[PDB]
Amino acid sequence: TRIKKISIEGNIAAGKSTFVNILKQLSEDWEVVPEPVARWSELTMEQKNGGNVLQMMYEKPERWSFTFQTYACLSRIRAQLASLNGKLKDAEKPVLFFERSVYSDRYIFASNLYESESMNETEWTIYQDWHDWMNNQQSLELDGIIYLQATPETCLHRIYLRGRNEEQGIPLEYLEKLHYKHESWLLHRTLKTNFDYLQEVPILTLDVNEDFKDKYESLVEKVKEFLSTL
Amino acid sequence: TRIKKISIEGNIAAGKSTFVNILKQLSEDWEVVPEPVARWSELTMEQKNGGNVLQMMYEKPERWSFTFQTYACLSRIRAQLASLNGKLKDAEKPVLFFERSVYSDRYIFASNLYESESMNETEWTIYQDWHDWMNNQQSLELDGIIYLQATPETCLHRIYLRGRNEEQGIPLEYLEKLHYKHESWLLHRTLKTNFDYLQEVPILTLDVNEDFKDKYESLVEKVKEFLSTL
Ligand SMILES: CCCN(c1nc(-c2nc(N)cc(N)n2)cs1)c1cc(-c2ccc(S(=O)(=O)N3CCN(C)CC3)nc2)ccc1C
Ligand SMILES: CCCN(c1nc(-c2nc(N)cc(N)n2)cs1)c1cc(-c2ccc(S(=O)(=O)N3CCN(C)CC3)nc2)ccc1C
Ligand SMILES: O=c1ccn([C@@H]2O[C@H](COP(=O)(O)OP(=O)(O)O)[C@@H](O)[C@H]2O)c(=O)[nH]1
Ligand SMILES: O=c1ccn([C@@H]2O[C@H](COP(=O)(O)OP(=O)(O)O)[C@@H](O)[C@H]2O)c(=O)[nH]1
Ligand code: NA
Ligand code: NA
């Protein structure tokens, strides 16, 4: 019938890609939209652009943050809309799991870059104006959020496990800042956003500090119970 | 009934703002969408952002070209859509004159900045991808184009008449480059674009080298004849 839209949120290396790849296999009624930035980490024009932008970002974040954030968010909206229009047309209970959302783009990542002076006030105000508009010009509004909650230390350890050379420099302090933002948005619900409906969207919080790759049935049971409430 | 969309195109200081302000007064069925960049040259968030971006552009175009071009084009689409949805609902023969278009944004200005190395290949490819997408996600497609054709020398003289301090440094060579692009697009129709319908859109070319402020009736007669053909 109508596709349920669920975003999977969480810190760097919390296990979102891992969890989403588990979910996709469990039901023909379940599909996933992987995060464009994750895929930037035969190549399409977007992958070539995104690999160049990520590389330049590691080199000079105060030059590239606005360009990166705008392209990442555009790429996400395009990919989410393509799945929403493309998939699950013959499903009985269709669910589309988004790996992160246009809200994590703005309120986690772009916000953090502005706070670190990697965007100036004009870049940040243009970005928010563009986001406010790019989102209204609607069908991507979330039915629920699944928060994969891990400690900064767990996420630092999982960056090490994943082994991308570019990321081994990421310090615990950066992960603690992103952790606080997620806790403010999704646990305390203190974060004010420009999207009124978000204060009321249901949120399922899953503790993923314990390795779940071979032992995920309890997490999936909580996902199925949560889905039945929507 | 259905609003006719006509873009007014031409080099810097050819007399577009002048012509559009003449047209708006002549018919209750005629409305105009002034160019956001022109208005950046009580202040809204967009005017504050746009004044800052223009100022930084004069200082360092190779840092600010991508940010400026994206914001100018967004601002234009927003303003054109607002007029298309807002105005001329009780008109018998409604016409909306756009001061320039999303096509002059990309194929005149952004293209020129890429050619001058003020955008690198990644910035230019991201911009074109964004434009290709930002335009499809449709109701702004043009019914006709009015080309206000002036020599670079006329336009250089009219920059002097207009007297904006920031512009007095603009050299003839820059105006000659923008002139060639307009002639390729609108006179020879040699310019290849990613918008197939544009090769076939009617174009009215008006020679505006002679001052028309007190003597514009022949130009308006050619506009009314052109409109009757659409
Ligand atoms: C794996 C993280 C990749 N990463 C980023 N990703 C995103 C992102 N944005 C989305 N919209 C979606 C999405 N999925 N991802 C935004 S930025 C990234 C981060 C840093 C970076 C390094 C170091 C510190 S810091 O805290 O040590 N510090 C340094 C000194 N000074 C400036 C203050 C801050 N901060 C950020 C540099 C490059 C990059 C690509
Ligand atoms: C009145 C023109 C304002 N102007 C511009 N406007 C637009 C624009 N874009 C739209 N999408 C819509 C729209 N309405 N306008 C784009 S750029 C602008 C132009 C220059 C500038 C100066 C000098 C030379 S140059 O040829 O002398 N040369 C210098 C050495 N080196 C780099 C090679 C080039 N080129 C550009 C610098 C700032 C600015 C704001
Ligand atoms: O229960 C888990 C969850 C994740 N990982 C590993 O932790 C790293 C990061 O996970 P992922 O890529 O899923 O994190 P994301 O950034 O997508 O949240 C990867 O090497 C995973 O194989 C793990 O070993 N056990
Ligand atoms: O027939 C004309 C057309 C224009 N102008 C002057 O030329 C300058 C630039 O015109 P406009 O602002 O209309 O140019 P645009 O950049 O909008 O094409 C202004 O000072 C106008 O008053 C003029 O004196 N006579
Ligand atoms: Na599936
Ligand atoms: Na009018």
Side-chain angles (χ1 to χ4, degrees), chain B residues 12 35-38 41 53-59 61-62 65 68-69 72-73 76 100-101 104-106 108-110 112-113 116-118 127 159 162 164 166-167 169-171 173-175 177-178:
Chain B
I12 296 159
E35 170 166 70
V37 178
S41 332
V53 176
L54 274 176
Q55 192 173 25
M56 287 198 278
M57 261 296 296
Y58 276 116
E59 281 316 306
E62 67 274 26
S65 285
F68 172 37
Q69 291 302 300
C73 192
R76 182 186 303 284
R100 289 209 178 107
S101 64
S104 13
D105 288 326
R106 167 167 176 176
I108 303 301
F109 287 103
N112 166 265
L113 287 168
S116 295
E117 311 162 34
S118 295
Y127 172 88
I159 292 170
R162 188 163 56 201
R164 300 162 176 167
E166 315 91 341
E167 297 185 353
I170 299 297
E173 292 67 33
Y174 179 55
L175 297 168
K177 286 199 179 95
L178 297 184

Short mmCIF file of all heavy atoms in Angstrom, two decimals, chain B residues 12 35-38 41 53-59 61-62 65 68-69 72-73 76 100-101 104-106 108-110 112-113 116-118 127 159 162 164 166-167 169-171 173-175 177-178, ligand 2:
data_model
loop_
_atom_site.label_atom_id
_atom_site.label_comp_id
_atom_site.label_asym_id
_atom_site.label_seq_id
_atom_site.Cartn_x
_atom_site.Cartn_y
_atom_site.Cartn_z
N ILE B 12 25.48 41.99 -19.56
CA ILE B 12 25.49 42.95 -18.43
C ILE B 12 25.20 44.36 -18.95
O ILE B 12 25.88 44.75 -19.94
CB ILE B 12 26.84 42.88 -17.70
CG1 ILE B 12 27.05 41.51 -17.06
CG2 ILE B 12 26.93 44.02 -16.71
CD1 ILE B 12 28.51 41.17 -16.77
N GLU B 35 15.60 39.54 -11.45
CA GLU B 35 16.72 38.61 -11.18
C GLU B 35 17.18 38.83 -9.74
O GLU B 35 17.44 39.94 -9.29
CB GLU B 35 17.80 38.95 -12.21
CG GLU B 35 19.09 38.27 -11.95
CD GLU B 35 20.01 38.33 -13.13
OE1 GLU B 35 20.54 39.43 -13.44
OE2 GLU B 35 20.25 37.26 -13.65
N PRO B 36 17.27 37.75 -8.94
CA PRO B 36 17.78 37.86 -7.58
C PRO B 36 19.15 38.55 -7.50
O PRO B 36 19.27 39.42 -6.65
CB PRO B 36 17.85 36.41 -7.10
CG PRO B 36 16.77 35.73 -7.89
CD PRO B 36 16.77 36.41 -9.25
N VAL B 37 20.11 38.21 -8.36
CA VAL B 37 21.45 38.84 -8.29
C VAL B 37 21.29 40.35 -8.45
O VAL B 37 21.93 41.11 -7.72
CB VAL B 37 22.43 38.21 -9.29
CG1 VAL B 37 23.79 38.88 -9.25
CG2 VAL B 37 22.57 36.71 -9.07
N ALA B 38 20.41 40.79 -9.36
CA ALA B 38 20.18 42.23 -9.62
C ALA B 38 19.70 42.89 -8.31
O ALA B 38 20.20 43.96 -7.98
CB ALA B 38 19.18 42.42 -10.74
N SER B 41 22.37 43.44 -5.79
CA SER B 41 23.05 44.69 -6.23
C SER B 41 22.04 45.86 -6.20
O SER B 41 22.29 46.81 -5.43
CB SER B 41 23.67 44.54 -7.59
OG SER B 41 24.04 43.20 -7.86
N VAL B 53 27.91 37.24 -0.43
CA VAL B 53 28.53 36.40 -1.49
C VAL B 53 29.09 37.23 -2.65
O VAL B 53 30.15 36.90 -3.20
CB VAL B 53 27.52 35.36 -2.01
CG1 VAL B 53 28.15 34.59 -3.15
CG2 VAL B 53 27.12 34.41 -0.92
N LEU B 54 28.36 38.23 -3.13
CA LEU B 54 28.85 39.11 -4.23
C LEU B 54 30.15 39.81 -3.84
O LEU B 54 31.07 39.81 -4.64
CB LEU B 54 27.80 40.19 -4.52
CG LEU B 54 26.72 39.78 -5.50
CD1 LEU B 54 25.70 40.90 -5.61
CD2 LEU B 54 27.31 39.44 -6.87
N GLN B 55 30.19 40.38 -2.65
CA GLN B 55 31.38 41.06 -2.12
C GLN B 55 32.57 40.08 -2.08
O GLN B 55 33.62 40.46 -2.52
CB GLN B 55 31.08 41.72 -0.78
CG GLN B 55 32.22 42.65 -0.39
CD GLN B 55 31.90 43.46 0.83
OE1 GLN B 55 31.09 43.08 1.65
NE2 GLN B 55 32.58 44.59 0.98
N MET B 56 32.40 38.87 -1.57
CA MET B 56 33.50 37.89 -1.47
C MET B 56 33.93 37.47 -2.87
O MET B 56 35.10 37.21 -3.15
CB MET B 56 32.97 36.72 -0.64
CG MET B 56 32.87 37.09 0.78
SD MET B 56 32.75 35.63 1.78
CE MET B 56 30.99 35.36 1.58
N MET B 57 32.97 37.43 -3.82
CA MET B 57 33.25 37.01 -5.22
C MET B 57 34.21 38.00 -5.86
O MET B 57 35.07 37.59 -6.64
CB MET B 57 31.96 37.00 -6.06
CG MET B 57 31.31 35.67 -6.25
SD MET B 57 32.28 34.47 -7.16
CE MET B 57 32.49 35.14 -8.79
N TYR B 58 33.98 39.30 -5.66
CA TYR B 58 34.85 40.37 -6.22
C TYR B 58 36.26 40.19 -5.65
O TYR B 58 37.22 40.33 -6.41
CB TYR B 58 34.20 41.72 -5.93
CG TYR B 58 33.16 42.12 -6.95
CD1 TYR B 58 31.83 42.27 -6.60
CD2 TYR B 58 33.52 42.33 -8.27
CE1 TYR B 58 30.87 42.66 -7.53
CE2 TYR B 58 32.57 42.70 -9.22
CZ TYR B 58 31.25 42.87 -8.85
OH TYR B 58 30.37 43.29 -9.82
N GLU B 59 36.36 39.77 -4.39
CA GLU B 59 37.65 39.55 -3.67
C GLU B 59 38.34 38.28 -4.13
O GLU B 59 39.53 38.33 -4.44
CB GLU B 59 37.42 39.51 -2.16
CG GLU B 59 37.27 40.88 -1.56
CD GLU B 59 38.32 41.84 -2.11
OE1 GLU B 59 39.55 41.50 -2.04
OE2 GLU B 59 37.89 42.85 -2.72
N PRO B 61 37.13 35.26 -6.63
CA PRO B 61 36.23 34.42 -7.42
C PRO B 61 36.53 32.91 -7.44
O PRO B 61 35.59 32.17 -7.47
CB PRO B 61 36.31 34.95 -8.86
CG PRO B 61 37.51 35.89 -8.87
CD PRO B 61 37.80 36.28 -7.44
N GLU B 62 37.81 32.46 -7.38
CA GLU B 62 38.14 31.03 -7.39
C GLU B 62 37.75 30.39 -6.05
O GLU B 62 37.64 29.14 -6.04
CB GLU B 62 39.64 30.83 -7.66
CG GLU B 62 40.52 31.33 -6.50
CD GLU B 62 40.92 32.80 -6.49
OE1 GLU B 62 40.20 33.68 -7.06
OE2 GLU B 62 42.01 33.08 -5.94
N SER B 65 32.92 31.09 -6.48
CA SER B 65 32.12 30.92 -7.72
C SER B 65 31.05 29.82 -7.54
O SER B 65 29.86 30.06 -7.82
CB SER B 65 32.95 30.67 -8.92
OG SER B 65 33.58 31.87 -9.33
N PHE B 68 28.37 30.98 -4.96
CA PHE B 68 27.54 32.05 -5.60
C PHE B 68 26.59 31.48 -6.65
O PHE B 68 25.36 31.84 -6.62
CB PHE B 68 28.50 33.08 -6.19
CG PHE B 68 27.91 34.16 -7.06
CD1 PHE B 68 26.68 34.73 -6.79
CD2 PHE B 68 28.68 34.69 -8.08
CE1 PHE B 68 26.20 35.75 -7.58
CE2 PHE B 68 28.20 35.72 -8.88
CZ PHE B 68 26.94 36.23 -8.63
N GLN B 69 27.10 30.70 -7.58
CA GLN B 69 26.29 30.20 -8.71
C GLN B 69 25.15 29.34 -8.14
O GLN B 69 24.06 29.36 -8.70
CB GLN B 69 27.17 29.48 -9.73
CG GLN B 69 28.10 30.44 -10.46
CD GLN B 69 27.25 31.48 -11.14
OE1 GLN B 69 26.42 31.18 -11.99
NE2 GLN B 69 27.49 32.71 -10.77
N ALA B 72 22.57 31.74 -6.42
CA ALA B 72 21.87 32.58 -7.42
C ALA B 72 20.81 31.77 -8.15
O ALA B 72 19.69 32.29 -8.38
CB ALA B 72 22.87 33.16 -8.37
N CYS B 73 21.14 30.57 -8.55
CA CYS B 73 20.22 29.71 -9.33
C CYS B 73 19.06 29.26 -8.42
O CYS B 73 17.91 29.38 -8.84
CB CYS B 73 20.95 28.56 -9.98
SG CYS B 73 19.92 27.71 -11.19
N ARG B 76 16.72 32.11 -7.91
CA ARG B 76 15.94 32.39 -9.14
C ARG B 76 14.77 31.41 -9.23
O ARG B 76 13.64 31.85 -9.49
CB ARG B 76 16.79 32.20 -10.40
CG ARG B 76 16.01 32.52 -11.66
CD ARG B 76 16.77 32.21 -12.95
NE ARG B 76 18.05 32.89 -13.02
CZ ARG B 76 18.25 34.18 -13.30
NH1 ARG B 76 17.25 35.03 -13.46
NH2 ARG B 76 19.49 34.65 -13.38
N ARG B 100 16.28 37.10 -17.14
CA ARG B 100 17.20 35.97 -17.31
C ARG B 100 16.57 34.67 -16.81
O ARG B 100 15.41 34.67 -16.40
CB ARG B 100 18.54 36.21 -16.62
CG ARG B 100 19.42 37.26 -17.29
CD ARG B 100 20.90 36.97 -17.04
NE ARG B 100 21.79 37.92 -17.70
CZ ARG B 100 22.48 38.87 -17.12
NH1 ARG B 100 22.36 39.14 -15.84
NH2 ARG B 100 23.29 39.61 -17.86
N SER B 101 17.29 33.57 -16.91
CA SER B 101 16.72 32.23 -16.73
C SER B 101 17.77 31.35 -16.06
O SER B 101 18.93 31.75 -16.01
CB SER B 101 16.32 31.65 -18.08
OG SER B 101 17.47 31.46 -18.93
N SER B 104 20.69 30.95 -18.49
CA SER B 104 21.77 31.96 -18.52
C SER B 104 22.64 31.74 -17.28
O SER B 104 23.88 31.81 -17.38
CB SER B 104 21.34 33.40 -18.57
OG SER B 104 19.98 33.61 -18.30
N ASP B 105 22.04 31.32 -16.17
CA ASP B 105 22.86 31.00 -14.97
C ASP B 105 23.95 30.00 -15.35
O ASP B 105 25.11 30.19 -14.93
CB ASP B 105 21.99 30.40 -13.87
CG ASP B 105 21.07 31.40 -13.20
OD1 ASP B 105 21.44 32.57 -13.05
OD2 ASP B 105 20.06 30.93 -12.69
N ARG B 106 23.59 28.92 -16.03
CA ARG B 106 24.51 27.80 -16.26
C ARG B 106 25.38 28.11 -17.50
O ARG B 106 26.61 27.92 -17.43
CB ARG B 106 23.74 26.51 -16.41
CG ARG B 106 24.54 25.35 -16.96
CD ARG B 106 23.75 24.11 -16.76
NE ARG B 106 24.33 22.92 -17.31
CZ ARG B 106 23.79 21.72 -17.15
NH1 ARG B 106 22.64 21.57 -16.53
NH2 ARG B 106 24.37 20.66 -17.69
N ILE B 108 25.83 30.84 -19.52
CA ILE B 108 26.56 32.14 -19.62
C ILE B 108 27.50 32.22 -18.43
O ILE B 108 28.73 32.11 -18.60
CB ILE B 108 25.60 33.34 -19.66
CG1 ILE B 108 24.61 33.24 -20.82
CG2 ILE B 108 26.39 34.65 -19.66
CD1 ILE B 108 25.24 33.17 -22.20
N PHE B 109 26.95 32.36 -17.22
CA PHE B 109 27.76 32.83 -16.08
C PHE B 109 28.60 31.68 -15.48
O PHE B 109 29.84 31.84 -15.37
CB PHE B 109 26.88 33.48 -15.02
CG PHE B 109 26.40 34.82 -15.47
CD1 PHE B 109 25.09 34.98 -15.92
CD2 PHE B 109 27.28 35.89 -15.55
CE1 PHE B 109 24.66 36.24 -16.31
CE2 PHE B 109 26.85 37.14 -15.97
CZ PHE B 109 25.56 37.29 -16.40
N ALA B 110 27.97 30.58 -15.10
CA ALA B 110 28.72 29.51 -14.41
C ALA B 110 29.75 28.95 -15.41
O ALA B 110 30.91 28.68 -15.01
CB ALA B 110 27.80 28.46 -13.87
N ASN B 112 31.21 30.45 -17.92
CA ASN B 112 32.32 31.44 -18.02
C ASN B 112 33.26 31.29 -16.80
O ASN B 112 34.53 31.38 -16.96
CB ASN B 112 31.82 32.87 -18.16
CG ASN B 112 32.94 33.86 -17.92
OD1 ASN B 112 33.13 34.37 -16.81
ND2 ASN B 112 33.74 34.07 -18.95
N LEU B 113 32.71 31.14 -15.59
CA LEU B 113 33.56 31.05 -14.37
C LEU B 113 34.41 29.77 -14.44
O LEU B 113 35.61 29.80 -14.01
CB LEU B 113 32.68 31.13 -13.11
CG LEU B 113 32.13 32.54 -12.87
CD1 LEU B 113 31.03 32.54 -11.81
CD2 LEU B 113 33.23 33.51 -12.48
N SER B 116 37.26 30.34 -16.80
CA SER B 116 38.26 31.27 -16.23
C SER B 116 39.03 30.61 -15.07
O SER B 116 39.76 31.34 -14.37
CB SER B 116 37.60 32.54 -15.79
OG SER B 116 37.07 33.25 -16.91
N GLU B 117 38.80 29.31 -14.84
CA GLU B 117 39.40 28.51 -13.73
C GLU B 117 38.95 29.03 -12.35
O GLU B 117 39.65 28.79 -11.31
CB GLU B 117 40.92 28.52 -13.88
CG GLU B 117 41.40 28.18 -15.28
CD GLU B 117 42.83 28.64 -15.46
OE1 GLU B 117 43.61 28.59 -14.48
OE2 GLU B 117 43.15 29.06 -16.54
N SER B 118 37.79 29.68 -12.26
CA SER B 118 37.24 30.13 -10.96
C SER B 118 36.43 29.00 -10.31
O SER B 118 36.07 29.15 -9.14
CB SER B 118 36.41 31.38 -11.11
OG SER B 118 37.25 32.47 -11.54
N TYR B 127 28.09 21.24 -9.98
CA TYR B 127 27.13 22.31 -10.34
C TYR B 127 26.21 21.85 -11.46
O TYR B 127 24.97 21.95 -11.31
CB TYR B 127 27.85 23.61 -10.72
CG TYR B 127 26.87 24.62 -11.26
CD1 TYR B 127 26.20 25.50 -10.42
CD2 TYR B 127 26.56 24.62 -12.61
CE1 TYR B 127 25.28 26.41 -10.93
CE2 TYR B 127 25.64 25.52 -13.13
CZ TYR B 127 25.03 26.44 -12.29
OH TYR B 127 24.06 27.29 -12.81
N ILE B 159 27.38 50.18 -18.11
CA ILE B 159 27.91 49.96 -16.73
C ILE B 159 28.34 51.30 -16.11
O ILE B 159 28.03 51.52 -14.92
CB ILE B 159 29.06 48.94 -16.72
CG1 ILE B 159 28.54 47.54 -17.07
CG2 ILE B 159 29.76 48.98 -15.36
CD1 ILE B 159 29.63 46.56 -17.31
N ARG B 162 25.26 53.32 -15.15
CA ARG B 162 24.54 52.80 -13.97
C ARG B 162 25.27 53.18 -12.67
O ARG B 162 24.58 53.39 -11.66
CB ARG B 162 24.36 51.27 -14.06
CG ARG B 162 23.47 50.71 -12.96
CD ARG B 162 22.98 49.31 -13.30
NE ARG B 162 24.07 48.39 -13.57
CZ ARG B 162 23.93 47.27 -14.25
NH1 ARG B 162 22.74 46.96 -14.76
NH2 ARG B 162 24.97 46.47 -14.44
N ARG B 164 27.43 51.56 -10.41
CA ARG B 164 27.73 50.72 -9.21
C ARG B 164 29.26 50.64 -9.09
O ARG B 164 29.92 50.25 -10.06
CB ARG B 164 27.10 49.32 -9.28
CG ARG B 164 25.57 49.29 -9.39
CD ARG B 164 25.13 47.93 -9.89
NE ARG B 164 23.69 47.72 -9.95
CZ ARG B 164 23.10 46.68 -10.59
NH1 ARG B 164 23.84 45.78 -11.21
NH2 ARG B 164 21.79 46.55 -10.61
N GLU B 166 31.41 48.74 -7.56
CA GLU B 166 31.95 47.36 -7.71
C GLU B 166 32.19 47.02 -9.18
O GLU B 166 33.10 46.28 -9.45
CB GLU B 166 31.00 46.32 -7.10
CG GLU B 166 30.46 46.71 -5.74
CD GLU B 166 29.14 47.48 -5.72
OE1 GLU B 166 28.77 48.07 -6.76
OE2 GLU B 166 28.49 47.51 -4.66
N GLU B 167 31.42 47.59 -10.12
CA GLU B 167 31.38 47.14 -11.53
C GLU B 167 32.32 47.96 -12.41
O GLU B 167 32.58 47.54 -13.54
CB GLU B 167 29.94 47.23 -12.05
CG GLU B 167 28.98 46.32 -11.33
CD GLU B 167 27.55 46.29 -11.88
OE1 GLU B 167 27.21 47.11 -12.80
OE2 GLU B 167 26.76 45.46 -11.39
N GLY B 169 35.38 48.38 -12.50
CA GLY B 169 36.58 47.58 -12.83
C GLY B 169 36.32 46.56 -13.93
O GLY B 169 37.29 46.10 -14.56
N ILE B 170 35.06 46.20 -14.19
CA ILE B 170 34.75 45.16 -15.21
C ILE B 170 35.36 45.62 -16.53
O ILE B 170 35.05 46.70 -17.01
CB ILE B 170 33.23 44.91 -15.36
CG1 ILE B 170 32.56 44.41 -14.07
CG2 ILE B 170 32.97 43.98 -16.53
CD1 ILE B 170 33.06 43.08 -13.58
N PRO B 171 36.22 44.79 -17.16
CA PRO B 171 36.84 45.14 -18.43
C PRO B 171 36.07 44.70 -19.68
O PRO B 171 35.36 43.69 -19.65
CB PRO B 171 38.15 44.35 -18.36
CG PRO B 171 37.75 43.07 -17.66
CD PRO B 171 36.76 43.54 -16.61
N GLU B 173 36.94 43.07 -22.14
CA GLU B 173 37.29 41.68 -22.52
C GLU B 173 36.27 40.70 -21.91
O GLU B 173 35.91 39.74 -22.59
CB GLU B 173 38.72 41.33 -22.06
CG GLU B 173 39.82 42.09 -22.80
CD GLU B 173 39.93 43.60 -22.59
OE1 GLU B 173 39.62 44.09 -21.46
OE2 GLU B 173 40.32 44.32 -23.57
N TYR B 174 35.88 40.92 -20.65
CA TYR B 174 34.88 40.08 -19.93
C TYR B 174 33.53 40.20 -20.66
O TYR B 174 32.91 39.17 -21.04
CB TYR B 174 34.76 40.52 -18.47
CG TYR B 174 33.74 39.72 -17.69
CD1 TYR B 174 33.78 38.33 -17.60
CD2 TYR B 174 32.69 40.35 -17.07
CE1 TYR B 174 32.84 37.62 -16.87
CE2 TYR B 174 31.75 39.67 -16.33
CZ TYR B 174 31.81 38.29 -16.22
OH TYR B 174 30.81 37.68 -15.50
N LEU B 175 33.14 41.43 -20.99
CA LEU B 175 31.86 41.67 -21.72
C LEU B 175 31.89 41.02 -23.11
O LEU B 175 30.86 40.48 -23.56
CB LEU B 175 31.58 43.17 -21.78
CG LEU B 175 31.37 43.87 -20.44
CD1 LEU B 175 31.39 45.36 -20.61
CD2 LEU B 175 30.06 43.44 -19.77
N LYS B 177 33.51 38.30 -23.92
CA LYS B 177 33.35 36.83 -23.75
C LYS B 177 31.87 36.48 -23.52
O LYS B 177 31.37 35.46 -24.13
CB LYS B 177 34.22 36.39 -22.57
CG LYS B 177 35.72 36.35 -22.88
CD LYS B 177 36.48 35.48 -21.87
CE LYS B 177 37.98 35.39 -22.14
NZ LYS B 177 38.69 36.40 -21.32
N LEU B 178 31.19 37.28 -22.73
CA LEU B 178 29.76 37.00 -22.40
C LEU B 178 28.93 37.28 -23.67
O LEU B 178 28.02 36.49 -23.97
CB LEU B 178 29.28 37.85 -21.23
CG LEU B 178 29.97 37.62 -19.88
CD1 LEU B 178 29.33 38.46 -18.81
CD2 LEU B 178 30.02 36.16 -19.47
C1 LIG C 2 28.48 42.50 -12.91
C2 LIG C 2 29.10 41.11 -12.98
C3 LIG C 2 29.09 40.44 -11.63
N1 LIG C 2 29.83 39.15 -11.63
C4 LIG C 2 29.26 37.96 -11.93
N2 LIG C 2 27.97 37.84 -12.06
C5 LIG C 2 27.62 36.50 -12.19
C6 LIG C 2 26.22 36.14 -12.33
N3 LIG C 2 25.89 34.86 -12.26
C7 LIG C 2 24.60 34.52 -12.41
N4 LIG C 2 24.28 33.23 -12.33
C8 LIG C 2 23.63 35.48 -12.58
C9 LIG C 2 24.06 36.81 -12.67
N5 LIG C 2 23.19 37.79 -12.82
N6 LIG C 2 25.34 37.13 -12.54
C10 LIG C 2 28.68 35.63 -12.25
S1 LIG C 2 30.16 36.48 -12.02
C11 LIG C 2 31.20 39.17 -11.20
C12 LIG C 2 32.20 39.10 -12.16
C13 LIG C 2 33.54 39.09 -11.78
C14 LIG C 2 34.61 39.10 -12.80
C15 LIG C 2 35.49 40.18 -12.88
C16 LIG C 2 36.50 40.20 -13.82
C17 LIG C 2 36.58 39.14 -14.69
S2 LIG C 2 37.90 39.10 -15.90
O1 LIG C 2 37.41 38.54 -17.12
O2 LIG C 2 38.49 40.39 -15.85
N7 LIG C 2 39.03 38.05 -15.33
C18 LIG C 2 39.61 38.34 -14.00
C19 LIG C 2 40.89 37.55 -13.82
N8 LIG C 2 40.68 36.12 -13.99
C20 LIG C 2 39.87 35.55 -12.91
C21 LIG C 2 40.11 35.85 -15.32
C22 LIG C 2 38.82 36.61 -15.54
N9 LIG C 2 35.75 38.10 -14.67
C23 LIG C 2 34.78 38.08 -13.74
C24 LIG C 2 33.83 39.12 -10.41
C25 LIG C 2 32.82 39.19 -9.46
C26 LIG C 2 31.48 39.20 -9.84
C27 LIG C 2 30.39 39.20 -8.84
#
